Amino acid sequence: PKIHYRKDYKPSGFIINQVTLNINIHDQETIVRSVLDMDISKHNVGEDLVFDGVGLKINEISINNKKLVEGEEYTYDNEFLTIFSKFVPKSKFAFSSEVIIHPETNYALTGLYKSKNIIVSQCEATGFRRITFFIDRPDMMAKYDVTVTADKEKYPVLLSNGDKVNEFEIPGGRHGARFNDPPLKPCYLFAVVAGDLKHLSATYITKYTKKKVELYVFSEEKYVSKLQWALECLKKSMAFDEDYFGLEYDLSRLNLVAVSDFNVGAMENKGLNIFNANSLLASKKNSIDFSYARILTVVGHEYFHQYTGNRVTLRDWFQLTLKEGLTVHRENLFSEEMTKTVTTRLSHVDLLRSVQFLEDSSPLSHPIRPESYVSMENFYTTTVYDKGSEVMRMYLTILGEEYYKKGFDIYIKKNDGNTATCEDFNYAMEQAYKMKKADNSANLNQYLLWFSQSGTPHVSFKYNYDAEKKQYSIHVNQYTKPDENQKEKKPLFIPISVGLINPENGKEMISQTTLELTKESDTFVFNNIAVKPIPSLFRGFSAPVYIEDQLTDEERILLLKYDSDAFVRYNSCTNIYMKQILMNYNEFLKAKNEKLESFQLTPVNAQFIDAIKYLLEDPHADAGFKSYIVSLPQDRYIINFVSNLDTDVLADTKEYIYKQIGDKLNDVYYKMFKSLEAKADDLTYFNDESHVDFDQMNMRTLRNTLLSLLSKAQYPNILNEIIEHSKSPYPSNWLTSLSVSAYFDKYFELYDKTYKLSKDDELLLQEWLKTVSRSDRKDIYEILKKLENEVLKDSKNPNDIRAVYLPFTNNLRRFHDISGKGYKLIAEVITKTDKFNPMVATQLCEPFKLWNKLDTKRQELMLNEMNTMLQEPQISNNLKEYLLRLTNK
Numbered sequence: 001p002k003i004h005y006r007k008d009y010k011p012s013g014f015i016i017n018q019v020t021l022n023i024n025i026h027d028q029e030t031i032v033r034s035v036l037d038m039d040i041s042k043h044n045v046g047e048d049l050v051f052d053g054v055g056l057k058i059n060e061i062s063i064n065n066k067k068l069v070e071g072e073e074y075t076y077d078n079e080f081l082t083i084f085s086k087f088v089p090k091s092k093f094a095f096s097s098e099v100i101i102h103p104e105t106n107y108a109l110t111g112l113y114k115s116k117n118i119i120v121s122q123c124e125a126t127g128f129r130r131i132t133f134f135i136d137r138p139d140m141m142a143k144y145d146v147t148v149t150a151d152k153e154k155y156p157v158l159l160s161n162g163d164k165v166n167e168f169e170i171p172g173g174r175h176g177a178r179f180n181d182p183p184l185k186p187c188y189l190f191a192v193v194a195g196d197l198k199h200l201s202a203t204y205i206t207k208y209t210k211k212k213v214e215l216y217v218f219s220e221e222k223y224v225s226k227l228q229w230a231l232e233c234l235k236k237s238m239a240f241d242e243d244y245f246g247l248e249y250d251l252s253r254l255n256l257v258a259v260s261d262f263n264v265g266a267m268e269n270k271g272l273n274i275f276n277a278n279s280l281l282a283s284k285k286n287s288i289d290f291s292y293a294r295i296l297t298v299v300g301h302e303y304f305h306q307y308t309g310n311r312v313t314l315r316d317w318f319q320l321t322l323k324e325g326l327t328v329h330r331e332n333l334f335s336e337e338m339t340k341t342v343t344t345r346l347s348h349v350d351l352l353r354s355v356q357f358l359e360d361s362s363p364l365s366h367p368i369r370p371e372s373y374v375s376m377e378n379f380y381t382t383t384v385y386d387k388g389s390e391v392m393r394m395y396l397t398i399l400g401e402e403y404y405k406k407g408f409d410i411y412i413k414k415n416d417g418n419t420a421t422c423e424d425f426n427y428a429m430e431q432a433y434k435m436k437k438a439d440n441s442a443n444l445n446q447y448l449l450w451f452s453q454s455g456t457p458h459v460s461f462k463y464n465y466d467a468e469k470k471q472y473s474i475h476v477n478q479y480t481k482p483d484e485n486q487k488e489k490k491p492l493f494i495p496i497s498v499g500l501i502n503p504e505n506g507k508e509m510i511s512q513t514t515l516e517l518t519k520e521s522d523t524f525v526f527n528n529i530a531v532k533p534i535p536s537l538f539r540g541f542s543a544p545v546y547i548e549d550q551l552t553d554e555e556r557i558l559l560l561k562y563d564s565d566a567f568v569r570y571n572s573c574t575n576i577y578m579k580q581i582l583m584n585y586n587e588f589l590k591a592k593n594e595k596l597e598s599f600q601l602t603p604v605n606a607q608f609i610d611a612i613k614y615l616l617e618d619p620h621a622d623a624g625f626k627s628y629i630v631s632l633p634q635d636r637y638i639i640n641f642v643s644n645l646d647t648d649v650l651a652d653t654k655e656y657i658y659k660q661i662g663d664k665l666n667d668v669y670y671k672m673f674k675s676l677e678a679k680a681d682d683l684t685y686f687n688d689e690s691h692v693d694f695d696q697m698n699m700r701t702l703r704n705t706l707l708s709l710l711s712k713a714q715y716p717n718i719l720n721e722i723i724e725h726s727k728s729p730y731p732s733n734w735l736t737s738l739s740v741s742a743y744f745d746k747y748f749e750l751y752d753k754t755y756k757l758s759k760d761d762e763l764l765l766q767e768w769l770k771t772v773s774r775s776d777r778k779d780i781y782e783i784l785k786k787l788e789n790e791v792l793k794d795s796k797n798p799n800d801i802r803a804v805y806l807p808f809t810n811n812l813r814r815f816h817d818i819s820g821k822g823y824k825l826i827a828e829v830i831t832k833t834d835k836f837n838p839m840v841a842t843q844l845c846e847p848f849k850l851w852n853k854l855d856t857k858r859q860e861l862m863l864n865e866m867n868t869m870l871q872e873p874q875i876s877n878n879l880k881e882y883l884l885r886l887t888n889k
């Protein structure tokens with residue numbers, strides 16, 4: 001297997017200046033003609049000319065219009081086209097080819113493929129070489145002139161990058177369109193779409209230059225009524241880049257296109273952003289609430305790439321986080337401003353500290369800029385994206401908004417139209433840091449370790465107060481555990497946003513303060529601190545670290561009730577839960593190991609329960625935040641704290657803690673469930689797709705969270721409420737009614753009812769499948785077999801496969817059945833999927849990422865299945881490389 005090393009970067013011996021493509025789509029094949037106007041670079045040393053080209057059928061190849069002959073002048077091995085250097089010109093030349101490719105049977109959804117009746121491309125990272133020969137790397141920038149031809153009845157809409165400059169008829173019921181895109185771009189940003197697409201459109205006028213931009217959003221005809229919210233989101237995105245960053249769109253048109261079959265969420269091809277339909281299409285009748293934030297996030301994300309990724313692009317793939325971490329950070333600033341709810345930032349943190357912290361303590365751990373890769377398709381990770389976003393966000397924390405904006409504009413102005421590296425961004429931030437510090441000797445050299453060092457730092461505290469001196473100190477330590485990437489870890493530049501709360505009145509005792517920890521440890525002292533404070537640490541989750549606050553539960557309760565920062569309140573709650581979970585987990589574990597006939601469990605802190613009640617009953621308090629405090633931390637967060645985790649014992653532990661709290665609070669829960677109904681389910685704007693109320697959706701999240709708690713608890717006559725909830729027009733409610741009915745004999749009645757409501761909308765049916773998959777059912781394996789036989793069948797649609805299986809893998813008690821039957825089932829699905837879509841097969845490996853954190857019997861069971869998958873003779877490169885890394889082989 002070929003390993004690419006970051007330190008080996010070298011510019012090409014060649015230049016491609018112009019690409020002229022003709023893509024002729026036929027019933028049984030697509031013919032691609034390409035002329036590359038090329039040159040010899042200053043780095044050339046007389047080497048063979050080697051093109052990437054994967055799976056291409058050669059009809060002919062030529063140099064300067066002279067046909068080349070196989071064997072004597074070139075070799076092709078289905079991966080690389082090698083033209084021997086004696087036949088390579090020494091000055092500007094034309095290379096041309098004609099190849100045949102087959103989108104109809106391209107089920108891996110990379111290169112050119114057919115999704116239902118739409119022909120569509122996906123070229124990031126190295127998929128352009130599946131369409132035609134190229135030197136397929138992002139530093140090979142070129143001009144593109146693209147003609148697409150197709151049957152006019154099947155494919156009346158033709159799109160590619162740039163301006164449409166010709167449209168023409170062709171004999172035999174065909175037509176063509178020509179698109180000329182003169183600005184340089186890397187080939188991963190090429191796209192083409194052909195199909196019977198329907199659209200909504202609008203005109204946007206830019207803020208400063210007053211340019212008219214045409215906005216088009218496209219889907220298949222059946223779903224064209226689900227396009228409105230995306231178009232609104234795109235308008236909002238454009239305005240936010242204008243307003244926060246002073247950046248306008250530069251092109252006359254931007255197209256968004258939904259397709260049914262997509263490996264990920266969406267892709268930022270220049271002027272032609274292509275989406276998984278689940279991340280573009282919604283309507284209030286046919287979508288759950290989460291779709292609205294998802295579409296806002298993903299439309300924004302792709303729009304913000306037009307600067308961070310498209311106008312400023314990557315020198316090489318090791319710089320991926322430079323465009324992805326920075327664009328996720330832009331999208332989170334945008335979504336925080338649009339939603340105006342504290343749960344937006346909390347949801348990001350909740351995902352990071354579960355999914356990304358698990359990755360970073362697994363055998364897969366990597367820094368946000370890895371040193372090597374084998375599969376690019378395996379490189380697009382939550383580390384690169386979400387820890388990258390937190391690294392890009394720490395610059396804003398460190399600089400403050402004014403100097404952050406100054407530094408960001410330096411980045412953009414200096415690198416616009418060019419490739420760039422992570423150092424170029426750090427350089428820009430450093431210029432702003434010198435300005436903020438009024439010190440031309442200040443530097444951010446240490447900050448570069450965030451790009452190279454893997455692992456999650458642990459930050460811990462000790463406190464001291466001298467009442468006579470009115471002097472308070474915070475002593476802080478950082479540690480990252482050694483791992484396979486660095487034997488010796490270095491201290492990082494860690495910004496610690498802090499407040500000091502006066503415990504008598506809840507007020508702030510100091511102004512906004514960001515401690516800059518740059519050493520393994522430091523002591524920060526504060527004078528004129530009139531009373532011993534409770535420290536409010538890492539406000540807004542100011543660094544991506546494990547926080548050990550060394551506070552008592554009394555102190556954490558005070559912060560939970562009275563602190564100003566949503567994250568520290570949420571975290572203090574989290575930390576109270578964790579202390580309880582670890583304690584009860586140990587008590588259950590000992591009882592199990594020692595085969596005890598009786599034993600004691602430590603009860604939940606009663607003052608903590610009283611604090612939850614106080615917050616729930618506060619009508620001025622936020623409904624989204626409330627839904628977080630009545631929820632235990634995610635299992636994937638908890639597992640980072642326990643070695644040899646016995647998932648049964650954790651399930652018993654969570655059950656005990658929820659029952660303890662419900663035995664005190666269920667009447668409060670029920671009262672709130674009923675009082676929230678009027679606002680939460682208000683239908684005033686149900687037929688207005690432009691009108692989206694994130695607070696209202698958070699009220700529904702709270703009701704649905706409470707209903708789940710009350711259902712599990714078998715609260716008296718709660719089934720009455722469940723049955724009424726099933727009649728709500730909102731899919732979030734009526735799908736909730738299905739999952740909470742799992743505890744009642746009405747489950748299959750609601751299963752049928754909600755299936756009939758879901759089956760005629762492709763995306764809604766996928767949401768129904770997820771609901772079934774995640775249902776807390778003792779018969780879940782028989783249910784999954786019924787989904788397979790009756791609904792999923794042999795679909796190759798990644799959304800269908802992910803919907804049926806991934807939610808079930810989060811079923812702690814059943815997925816981890818001690819027989820290993822759940823591991824066996826998901827391994828079978830992975831191997832089956834790997835035959836046609838290696839990228840999605842590796843996504844389906846997700847539950848195995850924590851294998852070496854489980855109890856020794858479950859470790860053995862998971863390892864056995866991974867070794868079985870590794871022994872499949874036909875295993876893909878992707879899946880083999882991933883499982884070899886995951887199993888430390």
Ligand SMILES: CC(C)(C)CC(=O)N[C@@H](C(=O)NO)c1ccc(-c2cc(F)c(F)c(F)c2)cc1
Binds near residue numbers: 124126263301324378
């Ligand atoms: C929307 C988001 C950022 C939550 C997840 C997502 O859809 N990521 C995109 C992205 O960054 N869009 O700007 C993504 C796009 C392409 C790919 C990608 C990489 C491959 F190597 C590949 F083969 C492929 F098919 C897709 C992976 C992620």
Ligand SMILES: [Mg+2]
Binds near residue numbers: 055056057100101102
């Ligand atoms: Mg082929």
Ligand SMILES: [Mg+2]
Binds near residue numbers: 207239242
């Ligand atoms: Mg404006």
Ligand SMILES: [Mg+2]
Binds near residue numbers: 297
């Ligand atoms: Mg996101």
Ligand SMILES: [Mg+2]
Binds near residue numbers: 464465466471472473
């Ligand atoms: Mg002191």
Ligand SMILES: [Mg+2]
Binds near residue numbers: 762797
């Ligand atoms: Mg389908």
Ligand SMILES: [Zn+2]
Binds near residue numbers: 268301323
């Ligand atoms: Zn992206």
